[PDB]
Amino acid sequence: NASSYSYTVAETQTFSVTHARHMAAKVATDLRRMQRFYGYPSDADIEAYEEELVVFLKAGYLGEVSYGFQKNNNWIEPTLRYTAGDLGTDDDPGKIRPGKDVSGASFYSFMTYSSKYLNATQSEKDTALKDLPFKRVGAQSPGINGYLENDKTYSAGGRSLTRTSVRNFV
Amino acid sequence: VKPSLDELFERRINFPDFEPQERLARLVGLDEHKDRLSKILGLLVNPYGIQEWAKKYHPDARAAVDTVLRRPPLVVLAGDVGSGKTELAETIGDAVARQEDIDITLYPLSLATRGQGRVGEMTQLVSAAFDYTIEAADKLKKARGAVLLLIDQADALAQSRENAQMHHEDRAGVNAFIRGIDRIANQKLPAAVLMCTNRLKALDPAVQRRAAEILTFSRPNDEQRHYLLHSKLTGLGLNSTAVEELVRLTGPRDPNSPGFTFSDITQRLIPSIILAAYPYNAVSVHSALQVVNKMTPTPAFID
Amino acid sequence: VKPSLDELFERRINFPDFEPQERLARLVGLDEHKDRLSKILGLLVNPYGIQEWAKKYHPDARAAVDTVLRRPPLVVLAGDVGSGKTELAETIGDAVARQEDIDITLYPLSLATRGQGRVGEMTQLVSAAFDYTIEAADKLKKARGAVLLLIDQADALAQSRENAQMHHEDRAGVNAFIRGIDRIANQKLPAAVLMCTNRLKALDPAVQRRAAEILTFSRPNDEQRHYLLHSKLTGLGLNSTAVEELVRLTGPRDPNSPGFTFSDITQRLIPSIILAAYPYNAVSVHSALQVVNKMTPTPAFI
Amino acid sequence: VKPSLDELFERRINFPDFEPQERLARLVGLDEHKDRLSKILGLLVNPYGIQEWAKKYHPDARAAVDTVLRRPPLVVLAGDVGSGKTELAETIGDAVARQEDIDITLYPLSLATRGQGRVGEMTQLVSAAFDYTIEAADKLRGAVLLLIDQADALAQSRENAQMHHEDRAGVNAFIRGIDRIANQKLPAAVLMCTNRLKALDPAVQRRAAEILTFSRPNDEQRHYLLHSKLTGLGLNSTAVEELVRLTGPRDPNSPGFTFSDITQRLIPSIILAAYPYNAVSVHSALQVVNKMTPTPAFI
Amino acid sequence: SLDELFERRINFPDFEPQERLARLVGLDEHKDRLSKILGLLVNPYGIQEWAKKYHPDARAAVDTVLRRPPLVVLAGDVGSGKTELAETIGDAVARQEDIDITLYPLSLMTQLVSAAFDYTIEAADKLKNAVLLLIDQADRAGVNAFIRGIDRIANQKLPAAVLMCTNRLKALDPAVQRRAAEILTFSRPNDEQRHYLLHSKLTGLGLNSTAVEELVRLTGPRDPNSPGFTFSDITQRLIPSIILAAYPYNAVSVHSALQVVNKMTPTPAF
Amino acid sequence: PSLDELFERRINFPDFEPQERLARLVGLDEHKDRLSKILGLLVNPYGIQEWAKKYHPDARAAVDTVLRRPPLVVLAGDVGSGKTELAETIGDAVARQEDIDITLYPLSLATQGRVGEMTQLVSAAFDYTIEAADKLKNKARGAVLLL
Amino acid sequence: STEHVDHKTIARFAEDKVNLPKVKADDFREQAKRLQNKLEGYLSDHPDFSLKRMIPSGSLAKGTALRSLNDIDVAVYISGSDAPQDLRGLLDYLADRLRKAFPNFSPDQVKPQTYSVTVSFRGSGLDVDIVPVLYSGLPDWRGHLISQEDGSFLETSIPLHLDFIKARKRAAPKHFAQVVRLAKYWARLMKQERPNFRFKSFMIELILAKLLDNGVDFSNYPEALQAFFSYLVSTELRERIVFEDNYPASKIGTLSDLVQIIDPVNPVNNVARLYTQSNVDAIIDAAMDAGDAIDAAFYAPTKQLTVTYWQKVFGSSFQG
Numbered sequence A: 001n002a003s004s005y006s007y008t009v010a011e012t013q014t015f016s017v018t019h020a021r022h023m024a025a026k027v028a029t030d031l032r033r034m035q036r037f038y039g040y041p042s043d044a045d046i047e048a049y050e051e052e053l054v055v056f057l058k059a060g061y062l063g064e065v066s067y068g069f070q071k072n073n074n075w076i077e078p079t080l081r082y083t084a085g086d087l088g089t090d091d092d093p094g095k096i097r098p099g100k101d102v103s104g105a106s107f108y109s110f111m112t113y114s115s116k117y118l119n120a121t122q123s124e125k126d127t128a129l130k131d132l133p134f135k136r137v138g139a140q141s142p143g144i145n146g147y148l149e150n151d152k153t154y155s156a157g158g159r160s161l162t163r164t165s166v167r168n169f170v
Numbered sequence B: 001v002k003p004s005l006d007e008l009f010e011r012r013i014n015f016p017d018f019e020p021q022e023r024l025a026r027l028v029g030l031d032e033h034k035d036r037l038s039k040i041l042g043l044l045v046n047p048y049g050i051q052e053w054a055k056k057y058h059p060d061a062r063a064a065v066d067t068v069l070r071r072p073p074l075v076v077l078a079g080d081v082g083s084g085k086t087e088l089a090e091t092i093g094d095a096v097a098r099q100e101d102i103d104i105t106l107y108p109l110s111l112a113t114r115g116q117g118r119v120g121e122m123t124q125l126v127s128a129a130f131d132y133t134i135e136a137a138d139k140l141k142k143a144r145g146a147v148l149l150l151i152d153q154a155d156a157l158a159q160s161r162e163n164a165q166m167h168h169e170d171r172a173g174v175n176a177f178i179r180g181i182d183r184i185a186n187q188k189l190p191a192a193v194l195m196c197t198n199r200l201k202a203l204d205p206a207v208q209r210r211a212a213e214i215l216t217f218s219r220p221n222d223e224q225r226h227y228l229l230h231s232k233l234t235g236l237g238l239n240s241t242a243v244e245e246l247v248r249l250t251g252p253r254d255p256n257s258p259g260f261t262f263s264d265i266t267q268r269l270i271p272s273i274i275l276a277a278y279p280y281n282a283v284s285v286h287s288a289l290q291v292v293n294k295m296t297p298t299p300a301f302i303d
Numbered sequence C: 001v002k003p004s005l006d007e008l009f010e011r012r013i014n015f016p017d018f019e020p021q022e023r024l025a026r027l028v029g030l031d032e033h034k035d036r037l038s039k040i041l042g043l044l045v046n047p048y049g050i051q052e053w054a055k056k057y058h059p060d061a062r063a064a065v066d067t068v069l070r071r072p073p074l075v076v077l078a079g080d081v082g083s084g085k086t087e088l089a090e091t092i093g094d095a096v097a098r099q100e101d102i103d104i105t106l107y108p109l110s111l112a113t114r115g116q117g118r119v120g121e122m123t124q125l126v127s128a129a130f131d132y133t134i135e136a137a138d139k140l141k142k143a144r145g146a147v148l149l150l151i152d153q154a155d156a157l158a159q160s161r162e163n164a165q166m167h168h169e170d171r172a173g174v175n176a177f178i179r180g181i182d183r184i185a186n187q188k189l190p191a192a193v194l195m196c197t198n199r200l201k202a203l204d205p206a207v208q209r210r211a212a213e214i215l216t217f218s219r220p221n222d223e224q225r226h227y228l229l230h231s232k233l234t235g236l237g238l239n240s241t242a243v244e245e246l247v248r249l250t251g252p253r254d255p256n257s258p259g260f261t262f263s264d265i266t267q268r269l270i271p272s273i274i275l276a277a278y279p280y281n282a283v284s285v286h287s288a289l290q291v292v293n294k295m296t297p298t299p300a301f302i
Numbered sequence D: 001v002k003p004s005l006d007e008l009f010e011r012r013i014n015f016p017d018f019e020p021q022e023r024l025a026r027l028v029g030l031d032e033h034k035d036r037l038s039k040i041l042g043l044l045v046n047p048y049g050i051q052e053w054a055k056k057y058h059p060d061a062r063a064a065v066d067t068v069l070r071r072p073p074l075v076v077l078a079g080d081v082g083s084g085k086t087e088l089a090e091t092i093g094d095a096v097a098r099q100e101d102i103d104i105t106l107y108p109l110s111l112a113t114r115g116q117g118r119v120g121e122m123t124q125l126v127s128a129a130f131d132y133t134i135e136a137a138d139k140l141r142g143a144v145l146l147l148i149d150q151a152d153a154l155a156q157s158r159e160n161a162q163m164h165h166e167d168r169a170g171v172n173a174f175i176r177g178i179d180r181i182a183n184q185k186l187p188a189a190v191l192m193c194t195n196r197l198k199a200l201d202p203a204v205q206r207r208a209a210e211i212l213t214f215s216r217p218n219d220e221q222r223h224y225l226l227h228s229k230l231t232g233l234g235l236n237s238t239a240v241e242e243l244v245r246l247t248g249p250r251d252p253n254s255p256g257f258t259f260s261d262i263t264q265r266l267i268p269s270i271i272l273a274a275y276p277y278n279a280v281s282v283h284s285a286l287q288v289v290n291k292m293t294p295t296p297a298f299i
Numbered sequence E: 001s002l003d004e005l006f007e008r009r010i011n012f013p014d015f016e017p018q019e020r021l022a023r024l025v026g027l028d029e030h031k032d033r034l035s036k037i038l039g040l041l042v043n044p045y046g047i048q049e050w051a052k053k054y055h056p057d058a059r060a061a062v063d064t065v066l067r068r069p070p071l072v073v074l075a076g077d078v079g080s081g082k083t084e085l086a087e088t089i090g091d092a093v094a095r096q097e098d099i100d101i102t103l104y105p106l107s108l109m110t111q112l113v114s115a116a117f118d119y120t121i122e123a124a125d126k127l128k129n130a131v132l133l134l135i136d137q138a139d140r141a142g143v144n145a146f147i148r149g150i151d152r153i154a155n156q157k158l159p160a161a162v163l164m165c166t167n168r169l170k171a172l173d174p175a176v177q178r179r180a181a182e183i184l185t186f187s188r189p190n191d192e193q194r195h196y197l198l199h200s201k202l203t204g205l206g207l208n209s210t211a212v213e214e215l216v217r218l219t220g221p222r223d224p225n226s227p228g229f230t231f232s233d234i235t236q237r238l239i240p241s242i243i244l245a246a247y248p249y250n251a252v253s254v255h256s257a258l259q260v261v262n263k264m265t266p267t268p269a270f
Numbered sequence F: 001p002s003l004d005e006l007f008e009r010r011i012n013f014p015d016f017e018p019q020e021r022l023a024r025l026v027g028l029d030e031h032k033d034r035l036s037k038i039l040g041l042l043v044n045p046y047g048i049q050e051w052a053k054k055y056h057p058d059a060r061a062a063v064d065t066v067l068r069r070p071p072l073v074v075l076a077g078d079v080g081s082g083k084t085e086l087a088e089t090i091g092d093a094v095a096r097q098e099d100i101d102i103t104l105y106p107l108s109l110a111t112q113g114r115v116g117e118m119t120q121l122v123s124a125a126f127d128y129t130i131e132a133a134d135k136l137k138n139k140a141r142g143a144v145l146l147l
Numbered sequence G: 001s002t003e004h005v006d007h008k009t010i011a012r013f014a015e016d017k018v019n020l021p022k023v024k025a026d027d028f029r030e031q032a033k034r035l036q037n038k039l040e041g042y043l044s045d046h047p048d049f050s051l052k053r054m055i056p057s058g059s060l061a062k063g064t065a066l067r068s069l070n071d072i073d074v075a076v077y078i079s080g081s082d083a084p085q086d087l088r089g090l091l092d093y094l095a096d097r098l099r100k101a102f103p104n105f106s107p108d109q110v111k112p113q114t115y116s117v118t119v120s121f122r123g124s125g126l127d128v129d130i131v132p133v134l135y136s137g138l139p140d141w142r143g144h145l146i147s148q149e150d151g152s153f154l155e156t157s158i159p160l161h162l163d164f165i166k167a168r169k170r171a172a173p174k175h176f177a178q179v180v181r182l183a184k185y186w187a188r189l190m191k192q193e194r195p196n197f198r199f200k201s202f203m204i205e206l207i208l209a210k211l212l213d214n215g216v217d218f219s220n221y222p223e224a225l226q227a228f229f230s231y232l233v234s235t236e237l238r239e240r241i242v243f244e245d246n247y248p249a250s251k252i253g254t255l256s257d258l259v260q261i262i263d264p265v266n267p268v269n270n271v272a273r274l275y276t277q278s279n280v281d282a283i284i285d286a287a288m289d290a291g292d293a294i295d296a297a298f299y300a301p302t303k304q305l306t307v308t309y310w311q312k313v314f315g316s317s318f319q320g
């Protein structure tokens, strides 16, 4: 004959360190792909960035982070910005344009903190940021010379990173 | 996360309105069904009307009138295909809304209440749909307004639990369907559930006993076919002898043959007569005779 | 985070009250069921009666009387549709309350106990519902009150585990019911469980054996049809000859066909008679004869 | 965080106690089941006794004795509904406590092992259950009995498709606890009762040292039961014979009464039919049994 | 990855293997087919010399037997004596071919399998005389790894064979069974097997030879529909119950043992 | 339904294993020729179009019908006769014969009773086949074999 | 991460699924060597026979053969004025000479095809694919080869090509040959997945040889593969590749070809002459995707994910 069936679902999991390491792992991939074509950032630096991103994603403090090359106060291609979001679609890292004019630009990282980071007491931040690899200077936000292309989104259990790539104008 | 109105209930219809009034009046041969349906629905809105009737005609029967009001407000529209079950169920609230001087909202139950396979999902979707029905009527309870819960694909939702080819969740969905009906009757709310089925026998016995009234829809007789053809063949230059011929031929040609349905006459025969003439010819009597003889009525259910 | 009472338990009914009293008196042909239910529920609140009964008649045997009290307090009502299983189950607590001079609360188990789909939810919801019943019954433990737990659609909540199509969760919920009944019975709490079903055969065999009594309901016989019509047709101007033909027609017209239910007569037949006369005419024997001939009883399960 | 003891183990029972030995005495027709279960449990808690038995009669046969001693410490009681599976298992510890002159503690497993549905919760709840049972046994002198009142719900077959991965994992944790008790020499035994033996996982079924089947009583069993229970009701021997006939298969295909059908349904119905106005009557007692039908059985 | 950790080590011809082969009862037919099939797989030259001596003109018959993948699958119930056959079969084959044979058993993951095969091919290449690899008890990559190692041994002209012991044939991977040169099935114990099983365990129970004969009969297939006692039934149910029934107030008795077996019912077949 | 879950082990041709297996098989020599001929003409009908241009240039309709043929070859026969071995390895002989790469998608229908599963397995098998076959469209760069 | 899949994991994958087994490869070479020895003997009996020599020209002679090898590649040098000039007739001429060369083979077993003539064995052996070379006595067996892509005559030396390859295999004992197979295996999968993807095997060997000459380390297969991929994407195949093994770099001068990978034997012959821009984009996209995967596998947190990234490069047969 034939039959139908019903199913059960487990309890929805709280965002965890594994989820944070799943998204940060794909970020480090994009930084290494960028290094292969533009010599930056360093392998040792990529790990420090990945480890910082895990701490911040796990704590919920993060809002937006950007990595790439900048002239003056303006990001230039290649430059990858990842935005935290509540929402699922998960993609494979990559799609980095090569051959772009690096010129006299340098590599720089800028990070924007979430609403939760701003409300939390500073004693509370230290317990959550206990395992951070390095301390970070603040308040020098760059601009974007070209337009912005949303190409990839990485999604963990609860949360997602929406990435936009800076595209030089032609 | 409560399920929303739209997921459970599709799109609601409001009364009175111009469209439902126009469609209801076009129904041919459902006069005794309209009166029956408007009596029950009118008595739920305004109980005093029947109470006054008892006083004038049967003052001694105090228990009798209480039985009419306390029944579960369920009616079942069953019968042949294309007979007017869905059309009457949809538009009947309009004639009730105008005579009782109130506005009626019709909630048409969606098939999304079956769920997508989670354990218990159907039972909680069906339950939540009755809750909305009861919320809307609880505010309205002379009644300020009336609420109609429509279930046009009724055989899919309420299926006899004795059937072997159905999940446990299908049987729990009938039970949830039952309890929701009992829940509406227990309260005084002015809400009535109407359900239509092509196969009355497929419905569950526990559902069928709660049916305050069961209305049987059948294919049109010679009178109803004559009125229906005469109404819509006007202006096509077809004489009285021709329409009489078309009425004979659109009937059962054998004890076995079922005979033409209402929808077969309106939604098949007439437009096929027009399309044969379209677009370079007028409707001809000879064309109409050719079209009827080609065409066969829709086969009926075995049950 | 425990689930709420309103999430598991419908609306509570309290006794004694004038409506359940009036509803219980309307029932026809259930007098033996009312008597057996009062004996089971009465001994549940007050076990002394049977002990006093033993002294007078069978003093040497106390095993037999102890056997009546120690069994699980589950009564099953099963039978045809529209035959008073649900009406009797709801209003029986009223009659017991007056006779034992006690307050009784009825808890109707909701179909929400099955859950929305997460693993363990059904077992968690069913077990939770018993904890509420056990806790309330513990407060009232001669007991100063009783608790009645009603499971109105038994086949949905308790299904035979042998059926292949159900989920593992569904069988886990049946086991939670089994352990709940045993749990109330092991303690002396004055709580009873009543469950009604259209389909007794669908219920699990381990559920059935734990039942103290199984009460069967059927469609009314020739006499039961006469008493029910005569009381309802008061004031309708119908003589005894007409109602005799109604009793004959409400009986099975075919040797294999079922015949009218109780629900068929009170909620369908008599209303249809009134409404055809309404609003411009009185009830006519000619009309009463015609509506009955047209009407067919509700079918039955095979 | 470890779950509480009462979260998993319901109400613990100690033997020897007066209530258990009297409940065990009331059982009828399970004398063969009692002896095997009391012998197996006694050997599982105390293995020194069989060595003494060997010396008296068969001192040479070391290998024969080892087949018994080395069996896993799992016994499954399965059969018909209302057959005394749950009753025998809860009170059999007392008969083992008194024969071996040691006190025994019974740990009944709750349905809370299923839990709240967090991933990995099933595995941890069931593992913690076996951990506590091992803990108490490792310190023991005494005996620890692990009882599962409804095994078919806690360790259903993993082949079955309509169950979660958390569900199968709880079955897997259940297999590991039985082996984990078996490796160690702890004085512990696991009893589980199921209405449905076919519902149990095959891996569990092979692990059980012995499977005891409980069925509906025969002519001799029903007769012995009816006499003890109907005592002092003024029912003559000719009457109890007809009650024995009526509480059997009335058709070759029909099952006949279970033990529970006689003790918890038939007897109270006989008395309640007389209560409270009349004495128990042969005429009335014969009329109630003819109305009554035995409990149905599984396909 | 160390040779010590992977396997015990047995060299054939050795005296212990020969004497355990004599111990085996009821497996004579299996012993011959397993020896000859393993003998041809390791040493193809051996059958060709037999061929030219008895049927040299014939080539079509031998060529089917000549080319087969070097996997033998031994399948039987738990404790069916199949493991004992595989450990000692290498000795029997040795005396046939009169060449030295070395056996590597296997514990009971991808990495553990690959080394076992790689170690096996390493030694087997150098000998050029054979080498026996026995995976004593038996994710998808490990299944593949086992498939690949067989293919290497089959491509190269290597005197090496793989013995695999599995309890059931239902779930064997289709790619695995196609590669097996021969599948051996070990049924429920026969009269010869059941006697020696029962005779050792019933030692010292005061049961005369006549009694143990009647136990062999009763633990038998009976009607062709009835399957008869498995190995597990006799050792884990029958013999224990016999002791349990006597314990603790009596000795075992021929009458008591007979009552146990008659009441006992053998487990059904799949 | 995932490609891994649907199609068991994907076989890529040409390959020396299936080439050797196909040579070893016996009793199906007549079938080998036909099946290799029929499959080769269905997956690579390009040769007919060059043939048609020289002989019958005006006949467009005729060459269309050969391109539109339903490419179904049925192996009906008593089990164990060696037809499953042939079906799996026949593709290697077609690859070398047509000088083109072929991938083989094997589906096992007998390896639940759930309603809609038959349609789920069959349609999804054709969807993965058509996805792979569409990328090879133009001589075709390759072929796809659904078994 | 690299703990889940390393260089070893790639090397063992190459033996199991990419490489052609050595026992099968030597057996395939023995079919050709028998045909070669028959040609030498027949040439000794008849000095005026046109077919002066047969030389293995394919991957099997290069040691770069794949498990998916279609057939054995050998080149036969045609001499004497009898050989017709057209492609159709030169092949027929060769087939007729071949049948006369091998009396035991049936006439129908030798089959002319579009750009070569095939000798097929009766039982279980691979066909031998024979490319005709027009020879006029030039040193190192230089002659006019027949292009298998379009049939045009190419003036080159196959024995010198073989020396070129073997010099690189001597530069990287086992690794250069292994990376060539890994790249050719990837390319063969890519050919079926990507339309407009074309990549010649000899060409892949020329590109990898340049990277080996440039100091790229071939001891690590993931690293060397990523260098081969990063070269293709960075260069975009617009940088000319030239080798000074047999001629100075100046000698090529200027060419209008879009892709320029020059035969190390003949500076006029450009291996990439048939490559178009549509081909070049498809190579670069696949080289981009392949590099994204291998790098994603380096940071992958679990082995299940790490294997899936490598399956984008090597297909379903890679299981890790």
Ligand SMILES: Nc1ncnc2c1ncn2[C@@H]1O[C@H](COP(=O)(O)OP(=O)(O)OP(=O)(O)O)[C@@H](O)[C@H]1O
Binding pocket: B026, B027, B028, B029, B030, B080, B081, B082, B083, B084, B085, B086, B087, B088, B152, B196, B197, B228, B262, B263, B266, B267
């Ligand atoms: N009594 C009638 N008089 C005139 N037309 C009718 C009548 N009944 C049905 N029709 C025609 O059939 C069309 C559809 O009818 P309707 O959907 O009510 O049939 P139904 O079979 O009850 O529907 P369903 O099968 O969805 O329950 C209407 O638009 C109308 O034109």
Ligand SMILES: Nc1ncnc2c1ncn2[C@@H]1O[C@H](COP(=O)(O)OP(=O)(O)OP(=O)(O)O)[C@@H](O)[C@H]1O
Binding pocket: B206, C026, C027, C028, C029, C030, C080, C081, C082, C083, C084, C085, C086, C087, C088, C196, C197, C198, C217, C228, C262, C263, C266, C267
């Ligand atoms: N014995 C009876 N005497 C008089 N009226 C009855 C009797 N049984 C049922 N009725 C009428 O039928 C109606 C429905 O019965 P009720 O729903 O209480 O039981 P039920 O139909 O067996 O339960 P279920 O809803 O599970 O079918 C009642 O409102 C009552 O008016």
Ligand SMILES: Nc1ncnc2c1ncn2[C@@H]1O[C@H](COP(=O)(O)OP(=O)(O)OP(=O)(O)O)[C@@H](O)[C@H]1O
Binding pocket: C206, D026, D027, D028, D029, D030, D080, D081, D082, D083, D084, D085, D086, D087, D088, D149, D193, D194, D195, D225, D259, D260, D263, D264
């Ligand atoms: N053999 C017996 N002798 C005397 N009384 C018995 C017997 N079997 C059952 N009973 C009575 O029936 C009641 C229920 O039996 P019990 O629940 O222990 O077994 P069970 O029905 O197998 O358990 P389950 O609830 O899992 O079906 C007990 O209270 C006991 O008094």
Ligand SMILES: Nc1ncnc2c1ncn2[C@@H]1O[C@H](COP(=O)(O)OP(=O)(O)OP(=O)(O)O)[C@@H](O)[C@H]1O
Binding pocket: G057, G058, G059, G060, G062, G064, G065, G066, G069, G070, G073, G145, G154, G156, G157, G158, G161, G162, G184, G200, G201, G202, G203, G263, G269, G270, G271
């Ligand atoms: N365009 C060309 N110019 C000069 N010589 C070429 C050209 N193409 C191929 N060859 C010669 O043909 C030989 C074979 O290279 P080819 O491109 O056929 O790869 P292959 O070795 O056949 O690899 P596979 O058989 O694995 O596809 C090379 O050694 C080379 O000398």
Ligand SMILES: [Mg+2]
Binding pocket: G058, G059, G060, G071, G072, G073
């Ligand atoms: Mg080649």
